[PDB]
Design a protein around this ligand. Structure first.
Ligand SMILES: CCCCCCCCCCCCCC(=O)SCCNC(=O)CCNC(=O)[C@H](O)C(C)(C)COP(=O)(O)OP(=O)(O)OC[C@H]1O[C@@H](n2cnc3c(N)ncnc32)[C@H](O)[C@@H]1OP(=O)(O)O
Ligand SMILES: [Mg+2]
Length: 411
């Protein structure tokens, strides 16, 4: 059934995954000198290209590929429209490796046909808590702890093959060439997410959506007027009423994050993320990059009490193209990013996220049920959507975990 994935160092079935008791590698330990130094062969009408993320045209090329060919919902009504500013942010974190960004161009006209991106991430990915307990019970604690140290790996995103080149087996060639470039830098695991089921996730969760401009969401058929709002004489005013929000944040002490906040946000986030099995470790430079406000891209607020940062939240923007509607072209969505609460209940922190997003013109707030996101779904009127996000590793055995034990937000 899987001509390419059956060749790769990943768990092949759920049955195999339910047998995994320790974290660790799947593949032959290899070394850098064993890996081919030459790019993977590709047909003579194509060429490999390494975009220059400091070049505006190169970012534009990648932008147009993804605006016209990247992921859609399952009914082909919405397609992501990541902005050029967001791709420069997401692709160029501290100490990014230019060669981990891999593209195929048609050699004739230099048309971008395919793309995949890798960035560094420092991930805790040792054996999870529930499995470490079984280990203790069998007298296998040392095997179970072997790979506890945070590891410097590759996070993969933005895989895309142009619609005219679909189902020609171009994606496996792009994946093999990214793997080669990453293994040439002495990194042997990756982490990625997908909406589709592939062999084989270590965690899966639903997406949730909090309506901020319900009249537009209904108009573009992102949501409907739900059948129950029919027993009512007037269905939309009632829907607006249901989702209305304050005009200003309710936490006194909330403000935008500034550079001098970086070391306090680092400490409070790192302490919070320790409570999850799988999660990133960020330096001060990586907190600056991922969390300092950037117009149109990432939005971050802290709660300051007695001149100390005690809580914060962040959200990022990804608009979607609305595939043909006469009144609207764009869905403006905010996505819950990292957060940490120490002074107030998480629901009261995240209400201010919704208030800020709504006053900044966002139509919906989205999240996956990772972190402690399930703890504010009902009070903040999030509803499950039709999608899921599945988390995967390349070359890493990992016991199945709940999505509430995952702390890596993927952009
Ligand atoms: C150590 C470092 C390792 C670095 C790498 C780690 C691994 C990273 C892995 C990538 C993580 C990406 C994370 C994200 O960005 S997920 C977002 C993926 N992007 C999209 O959905 C955009 C819209 N669609 C497309 O652009 C194309 O349909 C894609 C490119 C998805 C497939 O193109 P196409 O439809 O033209 O097909 P093909 O004939 O060329 O190839 C068919 C083979 O491709 C396997 N397939 C299909 N979908 C995916 C998928 N999402 N991840 C992995 N594999 C996938 C499929 O099972 C089959 O293999 P097999 O079933 O026959 O065995
Ligand atoms: Mg193809």
């Amino acid at each position: 059934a899987h001509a390419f994935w059956s060749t790769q160092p990943v768990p092949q079935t759920e049955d195999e995954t339910e047998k995994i008791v320790f974290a660790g590698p799947m593949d032959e330990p290899k070394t850098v000198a064993d890996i081919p130094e030459e790019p993977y062969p590709i047909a003579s009408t194509f060429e490999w290209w390494t975009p220059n993320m400091e070049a505006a045209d190169d970012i534009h090329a990648i932008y147009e590929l993804l605006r016209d060919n990247y992921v859609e919902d399952d009914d082909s009504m919405f397609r992501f429209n990541y902005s050029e500013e967001f791709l420069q942010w997401a692709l160029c974190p501290p100490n990014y490796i230019p060669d981990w960004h891999v593209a195929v161009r048609r050699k004739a006209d230099k048309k971008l046909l395919a793309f995949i991106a890798g960035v560094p991430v420092t991930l805790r990915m040792g054996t999870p808590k529930y499995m470490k307990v079984k280990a203790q019970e069998k007298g296998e604690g040392e095997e179970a702890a072997k790979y506890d140290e945070p590891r410097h790996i590759c996070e993969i995103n933005f895989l895309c093959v142009h619609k005219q080149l679909r189902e020609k087996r171009l994606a496996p060639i792009l994946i093999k060439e990214a793997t080669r470039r990453v293994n040439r830098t002495n990194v042997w695991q990756a982490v990625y997410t997908a909406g589709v089921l592939l062999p084989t996730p270590y965690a899966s969760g639903q997406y949730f959506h909090r309506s901020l401009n319900p009249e537009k969401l209904v108009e573009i058929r992102f949501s409907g007027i739900p059948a129950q709002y029919q027993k009512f004489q007037n269905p939309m005013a009632m829907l607006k009423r249901n989702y209305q929000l304050p005009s200003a944040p309710k936490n006194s002490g909330l403000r935008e994050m500034k550079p001098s906040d970086v070391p306090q946000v680092r400490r409070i986030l790192m302490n919070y993320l320790d409570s999850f099995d799988v999660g990133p470790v960020f330096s001060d430079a990586e907190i600056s990059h991922y969390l300092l406000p950037r117009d149109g891209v990432v939005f971050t607020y802290v709660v300051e009490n007695d001149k100390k940062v005690t809580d914060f939240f962040s959200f990022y923007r990804i608009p979607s193209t609305v595939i043909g509607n006469s009144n609207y072209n764009l869905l403006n969505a905010a996505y819950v990013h990292y957060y940490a609460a120490t002074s107030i209940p998480l629901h009261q922190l995240i209400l201010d996220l919704l208030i800020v997003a709504h006053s900044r013109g966002f139509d919906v707030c989205n999240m996956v049920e990772i972190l402690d996101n399930r703890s504010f779904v009902e009070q903040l009127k999030f509803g499950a959507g039709d999608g899921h996000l599945r988390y995967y590793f390349y070359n890493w055995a990992y016991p199945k975990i709940k999505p509430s034990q995952v702390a890596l937000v993927m952009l």
